[PDB]
């Protein structure tokens, strides 16, 4: 069966599954006694005082409240990480191919059990800063799920589908979508082959659109399109326990309770995961001439504690007309003030990616620049077939020990000729 | 001679005329006595506590100061009026063929005598609100000048090449160029043959960019395509004197000089004149699908005192490449909150234009919708050979008595068939 | 006996008459029964939903609510007036000579019968705007209080001291000195010869201290410098009726009630009248070269719908020292965005004044300009025994009627010899 | 040959070697082929996505590309360091003898190599905080450059001229004078003595000039006497390789690359290098009583990620007049939220210092007040021949371990008489 969804970036939604109808209070979030026999339980995604275009929560109408749990004992953290002071700083270029996925017949891995931190930046303990890390992996998850206490993930699914439990309902990703599942929130994650992507962790934030300023109304990632999980339930005991995972202070720990999490009848609030298509994004570009910097293919962003500063933003680079006339097509030749993590998703293969530091000069190779120098110019189809992306930071991206262990033009000035 | 310009919108500027040196005091502004014995005087274009980004002034460096001169006279406003309430409101659109100009065979009449209203809105006792002229001359303005004590004038030359002295220094402005001459400044225009331009007042505000939001750092109007004019004077005593012409509060008035006021020698700030060459204007707009917002064009924008909301945009649809697929390319039908007065710098031809009200419904005829719907789409040219503009506003425009003397589908759908 | 006062601009202040200790409720504001059976009243000066920072209003323990009053009735507004398009625009500078004071032995005229409006701009009716008003009267206002329906008052004294009865006490107020009256605020004041005084009226919004900058911590108008009026009851019946005068959309209105409104006990709260001696403003200027902006001198300020904007400030010229080497030390010749009011309380004499129009030029005389350039330079006292002031507006100040009847340089250019 | 500048703090500027007239492209940044046959690159100071008013980026259009090297690699970090966290707390005054210069005969140092960090505070790991350093070195930089990947440098001169090539430019930089180059910009300096002085570098954020507040449009650090090198380059092949100096995360590492890098032919923008020379900062003060906050010097500022706070403030105190009457004309006695670290350029003698921590008490000695309190007080002329200055944080500036190793009033009550 095909799930159905709700859209509508940061609505105020209200969800019921659909064999309970009215499971959802009516004209008040707290019954003496919720309709069904539920209990009310609140999600709170922000300070309770913040102005309401950013006040954030959902309220949970369950079979049992989150509460009913065992209490939590520390779990090894295999390569979950965040000491990027274990590693020396290094401005060069670090490039990897294809993450090596486990195959199953040799260790059985779930997406929790398979998740490598692969860099990152900024202290976790004061919930400032960002990770980046790789999940390989080739079972479901079975009778546990996961939460993180620190921040909120979004994911890209690059080879395998995701099929996505959340207490807010179902959600199937798969490469070329993403998905957003924020601090707290409990899920549980289907695999359906030998899997492998990438996840971009903010500490203490949440992600956002992008304004659009002169683009106006309409355009790069139209709200319409984030698609939200509908209300699903089962009410089921679990034998032996279900476990519930928590990333707390970047450690992880395990507490075990009597029936899954995932019996939310109904919900309503705007505090949500969300998943969206990349083939949706409607591309913004130069259609004179001129190279427009890659800020303007931005699909999400989430701000840091210095105004008008993200500390991190999800760029793609989709499929396009590129028709630029007079112009040097290919990205300029630059020094930035961001690190910027390169995936892609379908100078290295899907699957793989690649890590520019602060301040490091890059650009184009001496072929490319040959050829986009002396090129006949005409309208051109770019990047039919793939997509890249990129996760760019206002901190140094630093690479973890897994990350590091993991890892692999001429003058032509004529000083007399102007023309 | 080919005039030479400063460049970089809302630069601190320093400008001295070649033939004198080192005019500007050095390291001060208010010598005991300036270099060349000359006379220093402040011009603001803000308050004096303004923020640094939108503190505007220019110091001036001159043979004698602005007060020498005697006192104000009125003299007939001709066709300048403000006068809103003057015409009874409606809401249908309203063309005008190219505006007819006065033969100088007929009566010599220049740039100040031929200013005609054509439409406003908003109080100038307040200094709040805007006003669109047209200027049908066909005599350069001798020893007279005039400046408006209200607000900013962006001017829009359509037929006739315009030659302006201010006191910065001498700017000439084609058709297909832009020019501003803020509240304050003095400026003399000299023609050279039967000329019809637009002008876009606005009361007690500047122009500015536009943030570019994911556009980014570069891109619609780059800064460096602006240009100021070079410091420039003539020391020129005028026998009869010279006429100083002062719009105040929207009524006309005269003072005689001595001498001509463009006798800076030096000056510096970032409050000038400048002028910008629509040609360069870097285009952003869809290179995959639908139609992107006409905020995507804009050039310049005058801030309302709502927070947010521009008092008036100076939009342009200039040449470059159509290549969204699967779409209507052609603009939307639409209903906004702005009025909209349409010119053609090259429904009406080059030099007429159109005025259309706030939420009354506009798009594309039915010969457009049915071309468009059909086509086959691939990559094109549009507008190559032509420059339409808009001058928007945020309040209703209403025609003056002026104005309105010189004015002059079908259901496709398929209930049973989505595809 | 001499007046007590509290101190602290914006101060949330509590204050007793010393004749009732306790009367302010303890622990709250609103008793079931106040302390020696008072009513509680709020006068509240800003909308119940302000930040903090900007959130108004004061408490009253009064002996009769203001609700026991007649119903109000039309009088003649003598020459209190708004309307700004009875008189046509002027950009010509207009002065005054000392304002005629009426005789006792001619005609007895209190505070409010003797109120002239000289000029101002905006719409009251809109609640925007400002006028400046003269008050010449010869005898103490008598069993009749006035109040402000439109907007707030700051009074400078010129000629003869004001003893002003307010519901928070009593301001004696001397030439030198000035005080605030807010929007709602009842008030009667006393004159003890023949008296004449400014008035600068600001609508819809309330006067601050301007922000230090630079200056920092300390400097200018000290907070510790304003001072509030201590609790003061009468509690007095009036045979015949005791008038409450009303200014309400700029019309005069007169209410008869059996006391006198000054019949509050005690009081708590930020909104109050206050004083401020201008002998104390602590003077902030150049003390190596140049001549700064008058900005420098800004007692207070009033803020206009546009951000950063001032619809008026109070500026002042005060006696100090003068020490700028190498610079021309008089005002420096100048064109502006503001209109300006000048007056003098200690080319008119005080109690005369003159009026300077947006964007027309000013600046020294041919024998100012002649003696500040030739000067040997030296540390001097300026303004010893005087205090010239401004009101200036972003608005164009237009003249009443009543205003306009009371009404009345070489070059030295060496082209070859910079030096 | 004296150096050409160009002026105004924050423009937008354009400049080409005068050897290659037109080396910017015409009304584009991005040509297919650039003039002259060179590569553009564009070197960004902030996020794509600011605001226009803080959006830096300049555009070089250079010989070779900066990415044309080679790895980077692993050097000593001598006396540069950032671990704060390396020594105890100590809230006593430090204080600092000139630094001992070596001596070119002992051994060869130059400006990389006599860097010695003194002071700091913050994570630079996450790109937050300030170190203050001293330079100390007898010879020229050699076929090596030097660039900050974390931050920008505010360099101060003490003993000894510095001649400084960037990529924009040339610059002279003499004690008096100061510069700013900032994060990413490669330079290199040559000297001609046994040189000292000291740097203020701030992580993450560039140096603004301060609001002026009521000081107005003009005063303090004048925007005009900013002064930005003009173009320059040279096409230079370096045998055995010239070396690229990287301060990355606090961290150093060189690169090897054919030639200079300092081959920019033409270049625009408003991200540069830049130098202020301190005799013309307009100093404002008291002119009647009392005694300013030292925040009325301030020079250029630095944002911290806390709203209104700096990270660190340039504060002067230059030549002036001292006219306050009835007044302790010396520094208070005071505590306050900052740390502070004292210079001398021209209790130590020019080139030592003293490091003042948070809250701890300070103010003039017993002889000092004395001498203040009894003068007859007359207006004097204050630090002729002197140019002492300040470093001041917002937080607790921490000596370094070479720091550390290189360091160093009665009752008059008279309760019975107030007068």
């Given at each position: 069966?095909?799930?159905?969804?709700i859209?509508?970036?940061?609505?105020?939604c209200?969800?019921?599954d659909?064999?309970?109808?009215?499971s959802?209070?009516?004209?008040?979030?707290?019954?003496?006694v919720c309709?069904?026999?539920?209990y009310?339980?609140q999600l709170?995604?922000s300070?309770?005082?913040?102005?309401?275009?950013?006040?954030?929560?959902?309220?949970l109408?369950?079979?049992?409240?989150?509460?009913?749990?065992?209490?939590?004992?520390?779990?090894?953290?295999?390569?979950?990480?965040h000491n990027?002071?274990?590693?020396?700083?290094?401005p060069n270029?670090?490039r990897?191919?294809?993450?090596e996925?486990?195959?199953?017949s040799?260790?059985?891995?779930?997406?929790v059990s398979?998740l490598?931190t692969?860099?990152?930046?900024?202290?976790i303990?004061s919930?400032?800063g960002?990770?980046?890390h790789?999940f390989l992996?080739?079972?479901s998850?079975e009778?546990?799920c996961?939460?993180?206490?620190?921040?909120?993930?979004?994911?890209?699914?690059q080879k395998?589908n995701?099929l996505?439990?959340t207490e807010?309902?179902?959600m199937?990703?798969?490469?070329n979508?993403?998905?957003?599942?924020?601090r707290?929130?409990?899920?549980?994650?289907d695999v359906?082959?030998?899997?492998?992507?990438?996840?971009?962790?903010v500490?203490?934030v949440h992600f956002?659109?992008?304004d659009?300023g002169?683009?106006?109304a309409?355009?790069l990632?139209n709200?319409?399109?984030?698609?939200?999980?509908?209300?699903?339930?089962?009410?089921?005991?679990v034998?032996?326990?279900?476990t519930?995972?928590?990333?707390?202070?970047?450690?992880?720990?395990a507490?075990?309770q009597?029936v899954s999490?995932?019996?939310?009848?109904?919900?309503?609030?705007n505090?949500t995961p969300y998943?969206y298509?990349?083939?949706n994004?409607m591309?913004?570009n130069?259609?004179?001439?001129?190279?427009?910097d890659?800020?303007?293919?931005?699909?999400?962003?989430?701000?840091?504690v210095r105004?008008?500063?993200?500390?991190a933003d999800?760029?793609?680079?989709?499929?396009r007309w590129g028709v630029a006339?007079?112009?040097?097509?290919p990205?300029?030749?630059?020094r930035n003030?961001?690190?910027?993590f390169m995936?892609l998703?379908?100078?290295?293969?899907?699957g793989g990616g690649?890590?520019?530091?602060t301040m490091?000069?890059?650009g184009?190779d001496?072929?490319?620049?040959e050829?986009?120098s002396?090129?006949?110019?005409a309208p051109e189809?770019?990047?039919?077939g793939?997509?890249?992306?990129?996760?760019?930071?206002?901190?140094?991206l630093?690479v973890?020990?897994?990350g590091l262990?993991a890892?692999?033009?001429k003058?032509h000035?004529?000083?007399?000729?102007r023309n």
């Amino acid at each position: 069966a095909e799930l159905k969804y709700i859209s509508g970036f940061g609505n105020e939604c209200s969800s019921e599954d659909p064999r309970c109808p009215g499971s959802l209070p009516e004209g008040q979030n707290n019954p003496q006694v919720c309709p069904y026999n539920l209990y009310a339980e609140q999600l709170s995604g922000s300070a309770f005082t913040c102005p309401r275009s950013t006040n954030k929560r959902s309220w949970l109408y369950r079979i049992l409240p989150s509460v009913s749990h065992k209490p939590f004992e520390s779990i090894d953290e295999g390569h979950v990480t965040h000491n990027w002071d274990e590693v020396d700083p290094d401005p060069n270029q670090l490039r990897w191919k294809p993450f090596e996925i486990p195959k199953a017949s040799q260790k059985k891995v779930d997406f929790v059990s398979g998740l490598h931190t692969l860099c990152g930046a900024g202290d976790i303990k004061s919930n400032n800063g960002l990770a980046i890390h790789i999940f390989l992996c080739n079972t479901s998850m079975e009778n546990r799920c996961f939460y993180n206490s620190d921040g909120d993930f979004l994911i890209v699914p690059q080879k395998g589908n995701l099929l996505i439990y959340t207490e807010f309902g179902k959600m199937l990703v798969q490469p070329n979508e993403i998905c957003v599942i924020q601090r707290g929130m409990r899920f549980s994650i289907d695999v359906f082959e030998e899997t492998r992507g990438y996840i971009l962790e903010v500490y203490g934030v949440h992600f956002e659109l992008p304004d659009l300023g002169p683009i106006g109304a309409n355009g790069l990632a139209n709200p319409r399109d984030f698609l939200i999980p509908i209300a699903w339930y089962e009410d089921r005991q679990v034998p032996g326990g279900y476990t519930v995972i928590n990333k707390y202070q970047g450690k992880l720990f395990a507490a075990k309770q009597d029936v899954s999490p995932f019996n939310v009848v109904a919900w309503h609030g705007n505090y949500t995961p969300y998943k969206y298509n990349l083939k949706n994004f409607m591309v913004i570009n130069s259609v004179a001439f001129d190279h427009a910097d890659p800020s303007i293919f931005t699909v999400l962003t989430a701000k840091s504690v210095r105004p008008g500063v993200a500390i991190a933003d999800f760029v793609i680079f989709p499929p396009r007309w590129g028709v630029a006339d007079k112009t040097f097509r290919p990205p300029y030749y630059h020094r930035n003030c961001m690190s910027e993590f390169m995936g892609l998703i379908r100078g290295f293969l899907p699957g793989g990616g690649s890590l520019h530091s602060t301040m490091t000069p890059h650009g184009p190779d001496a072929d490319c620049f040959e050829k986009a120098s002396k090129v006949k110019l005409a309208p051109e189809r770019i990047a039919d077939g793939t997509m890249a992306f990129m996760f760019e930071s206002s901190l140094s991206l630093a690479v973890t020990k897994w990350g590091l262990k993991a890892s692999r033009l001429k003058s032509h000035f004529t000083p007399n000729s102007r023309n």
